[PDB]
Amino acid sequence: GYXXXXXX
Amino acid sequence: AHKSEVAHRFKDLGEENFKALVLIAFAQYLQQCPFEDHVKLVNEVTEFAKTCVADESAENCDKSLHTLFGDKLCTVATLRETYGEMADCCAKQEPERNECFLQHKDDNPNLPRLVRPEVDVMCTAFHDNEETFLKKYLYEIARRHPYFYAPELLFFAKRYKAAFTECCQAADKAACLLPKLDELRDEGKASSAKQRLKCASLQKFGERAFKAWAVARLSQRFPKAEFAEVSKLVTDLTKVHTECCHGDLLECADDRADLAKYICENQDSISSKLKECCEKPLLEKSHCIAEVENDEMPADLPSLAADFVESKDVCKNYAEAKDVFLGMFLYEYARRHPDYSVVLLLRLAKTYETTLEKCCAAADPHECYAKVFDEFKPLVEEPQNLIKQNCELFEQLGEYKFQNALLVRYTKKVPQVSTPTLVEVSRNLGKVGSKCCKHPEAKRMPCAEDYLSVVLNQLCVLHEKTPVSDRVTKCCTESLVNRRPCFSALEVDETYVPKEFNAETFTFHADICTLSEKERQIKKQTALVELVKHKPKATKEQLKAVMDDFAAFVEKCCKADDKETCFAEEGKKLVAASQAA
């Protein structure tokens, strides 16, 4: 990944 | 296959228990961070966990609990405090980082007293916002008791909530609620001290020591169980406490439930007393099981002499599996003796082990270990006479004056100890009176010596922080199992130089008449300690006379409501009279 959001 | 640990734990525990356990896990380490900070992080963790229950491939879900917990603790703890002990831990990588956290739980933190508002204010708050009211209950507790058994804390939380749900629909709200609350408070303090002993044992004496303790207690409780069953439970029970004492709250809560579930599924192989426990809901189930009565022991158990003393093969059978052989011996001795304290059983097993190590190395081992049970008689009579003598003392004295007796005794034993600490330990030692002397003597020793183990462990934990008494350090470090006899054996410290007479210590004001009964006795007991530190040779008789004059003086000045000059004048008159003895 790395990234993040919160999705959810 | 559970590619995401957080989702696994969330599914096993349910959203409600998970949110609560997370809040606990952070507050026990981050004890000085304010309430709102913990609220915010709890919500973020929940948001994240819910994310993963849906899609396990989402960001960061395949990471470990240690890595996740570490990362989150560090960014929270360093936000305001950029350099600190947690800053040091956070320069480490896993796994050294997770272990570094262990030293950053403060045991008796500098934290304000918790003062309850009016009954009416509490219930409006409880009605006006339930979730926050209850989280504040968890937060304020976890941070003051960083070693609280987390699954048990959830249980208290259930009972705290239930108290409010009942008592604020009630016709006399305060007469309903305050008794329910004060009992939880006292139970919570007693629960927390029990775990602190578990964690201290595990840390200062090792897994093996804890496992021995567990084999003893579970064999007394479940005497019909086969030895291999006890060993399984001991192993699971030890994994549970290792996980909570090292901060892995989600894992130890899940693993405690599985343990309750196992036990209820195997009642027949374990005990006949678990039937009511096992019909209760999840949190009460685990609580009930750990409090359950001893089962009857099986009918015609042979004496241990055949297998462990008279056989010529003791040494060969010991060497094939020493921990199994001693475990069996402990199991056999414990299951036949519910009337012995656990620490005494451990004391007995350690004596047996010591004898075998010595005897199996000597020329004729059989003639050497033949007498080993004769060594147990003195070890059994010592505590039996301690309890009997002290219960007689408590019977005529009551809890308050019984505490004063133990106050003088331990002040003369370890005068180097700070007065506040001496007052607290002595007050807690004195609660064995109410707690244990009512039971028939056939159950007194386990009640008493096991409770005293908890109290002394608090003394050791307090003292280690700021050490001043070499004798205290020796008694705490030399043997977990022998702490209580080590202290009882202490003679009066005749090397101690008396404290100089300072007239302010023994001056008292009318401000003592406004205090709660508990806070007034502590001030009276502080003075008794400082008197003994001033004249350590004063006799039990002379000190009783003074404390009776003192209590008179204090109650003979509260009823006065004069210019309160009663303390200044009648008090210097009390000091002349005390000098008379």
Swiss-Prot record, chain B:
Effect of mutating residue 569 to K: In Osaka-2/Phnom Phen/albumin B/Verona
Positions marked as site (Aspirin-acetylated lysine): 198
Binding locations of Zn(2+): 66, 246, 248
Effect of residue 176 to F: In Hawkes bay
Domain Albumin residue range list: 1-185, 186-378, 379-576
Effect of residue 353 to K: In Hiroshima-1
Resulting phenotype, residue 535 to E: In Castel di Sangro
Result for mutant: residue 562 to N: In Fukuoka-1/Paris-2
Residues carrying the site annotation Not glycated: 3, 19, 40, 63, 72, 92, 105, 135, 158, 173, 180, 189, 194, 204, 211, 239, 261, 273, 285, 358, 371, 388, 401, 413, 431, 435, 465, 474, 499, 518, 523, 537, 540, 556, 559, 563, 573
Annotated effect of mutating residue 559 to E: In Church bay
The protein's name: Albumin
Naturally occurring in which organism (per UniProt): Homo sapiens
Gene designation per UniProt: ALB
